[PDB]
Design a binder for these strands. Structure first.
Ligand SMILES: Nc1ccn([C@H]2C[C@H](O)[C@@H](COP(=O)(O)OP(=O)(O)OP(=O)(O)O)O2)c(=O)n1
Ligand SMILES: *[C@@H]1O[C@@H]2Oc3cc(OC)c4c5c(c(=O)oc4c3[C@@H]2[C@H]1O)C(=O)CC5
Ligand SMILES: [Ca+2]
Length: 343
DNA sequence: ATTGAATCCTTCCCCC
DNA sequence: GGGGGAAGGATT
């Protein structure tokens, strides 16, 4: 009668991988950070286990104000590389419960189990063989979501977490389509959470009050045609294998600068590790982005008829860096690169 | 107040 | 306006 989307989402993943390697931390509040040798203890949180969130230590906030909230808690520099090996291992596992996998991010996969589950009953059934396998061969807990489409399966997971599992039968959908808050619909942030709020929309069903031709100039086609597409219990987007369309790095400079010969070594580092992550792909395009003193991003790109040798990237960055320097007047505080249009 | 990394949607311009 | 290229925008 339709499709069943199974969504797996790792719990406080980054932090949880720190525990799985060093239980000399479980129970205690773990905070995964990122800095730069800037001032010291400067940067932003990446994620924190649940025993640290209760106190106001979520991702995003500067590790600085976090200390004044939990000077007791354990702070760990982030090892993105480590979490990535764990993740590629869990992912490969899921890969054998359905060849119809996606992988929204490093800790999210969407499985299309419509082919191996006659009904939600057996879905939940797989919902658990899975949670257990993952927890067995990785000692990691994951929350699972199940429903008719990728969007709701996610919303599910984000309710059953942590460590949970949940289901949303056509009935609960309609109940959520009229009851779930709006700032909770996957794909909406505070910015769009304002236009919708005051305009006849406080909840997903509200986007049914007003016609798109009035919001299709407030949140723009794709978005509106997407919200409404849901409330109007019509949404049914497929589970396609996501592809990496851009890799790159950006670093943070000790001091803010505008002296091109000072910046260049930074930009080059960014290109080298950036070219490492790039593995064995060949970008035809390339952009240089810089974070000025007042976090206002400025980027400049170039696209070629052919791939970009590393030797040519190094050389093509400066021009893009200079282009920036001339036009924009402010200083530079964060400089990096980003390759695109892969062959 | 710093530090990721990526998507995809949008919006202003050349050009058959 | 359409291909596509380009720089800023708004989530995750
Ligand atoms: N500004 C943001 C917001 C989100 N994300 C990513 C981080 C997560 O890993 C992924 C989203 O997954 P979830 O919100 O479902 O949370 P998870 O439980 O998988 O992640 P977390 O490690 O926070 O528990 O999107 C990101 O990179 N940058
Ligand atoms: C961007 O600046 C901060 O740095 C990071 C780094 C993260 O992961 C490596 C990160 C994550 C999440 C998040 O919400 O924020 C960050 C941030 C901060 C951002 O504001 C997640 O949910 C997972 C990783
Ligand atoms: Ca979580």
């Amino acid at each position: 009668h339709h499709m069943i989307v199974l969504f797996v989402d790792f719990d406080y993943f980054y932090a949880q991988v720190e525990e799985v390697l060093n239980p000399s931390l479980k129970g205690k509040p773990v905070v995964v950070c990122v800095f730069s040798g800037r001032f010291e203890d400067s940067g932003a949180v990446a994620t924190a286990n649940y025993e640290a969130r209760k106190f106001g230590v979520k991702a995003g906030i500067p590790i600085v104000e976090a200390k004044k909230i939990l000077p007791n808690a354990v702070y760990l520099p982030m090892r993105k590389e480590v979490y990535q090996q764990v993740s590629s291992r869990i992912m490969n596992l899921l890969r054998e419960y359905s060849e119809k996998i996606e992988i929204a991010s490093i800790d999210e996969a969407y499985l299309d189990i419509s082919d191996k589950v006659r009904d939600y009953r057996e879905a939940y059934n797989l919902g658990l063989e899975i949670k257990n396998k993952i927890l067995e061969k990785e000692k990691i807990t994951v929350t699972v979501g199940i429903s008719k489409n990728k969007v709701f399966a996610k919303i599910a997971a984000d309710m059953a977490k942590p460590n949970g599992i949940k289901v949303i039968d056509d009935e609960e959908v309609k109940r959520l389509i009229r009851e779930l808050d709006i700032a909770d619909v996957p794909g909406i942030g505070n910015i769009t959470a304002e236009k919708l709020k005051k305009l006849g929309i406080n909840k997903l069903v509200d986007t049914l009050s007003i016609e798109f031709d009035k919001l299709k100039g407030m949140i723009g086609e794709a978005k509106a045609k997407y919200l409404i597409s849901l409330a109007r219990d019509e949404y049914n987007e497929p589970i396609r294998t996501r592809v990496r369309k851009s890799i790159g790095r950006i670093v943070t400079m000790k001091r803010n600068s505008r002296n091109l010969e000072e910046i260049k070594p930074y930009l080059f580092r960014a290109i080298e590790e950036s070219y490492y992550k790039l593995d064995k792909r060949i970008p035809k395009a390339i952009h240089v982005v810089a974070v000025t003193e007042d976090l206002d991003i400025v980027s400049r790109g170039r696209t070629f008829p052919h791939g970009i040798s590393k030797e040519t990237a190094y050389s093509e960055s400066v021009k893009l860096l200079q282009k920036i320097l001339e036009e924009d007047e402010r200083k530079i505080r964060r400089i990096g690169v980003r390759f695109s249009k892969f062959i």
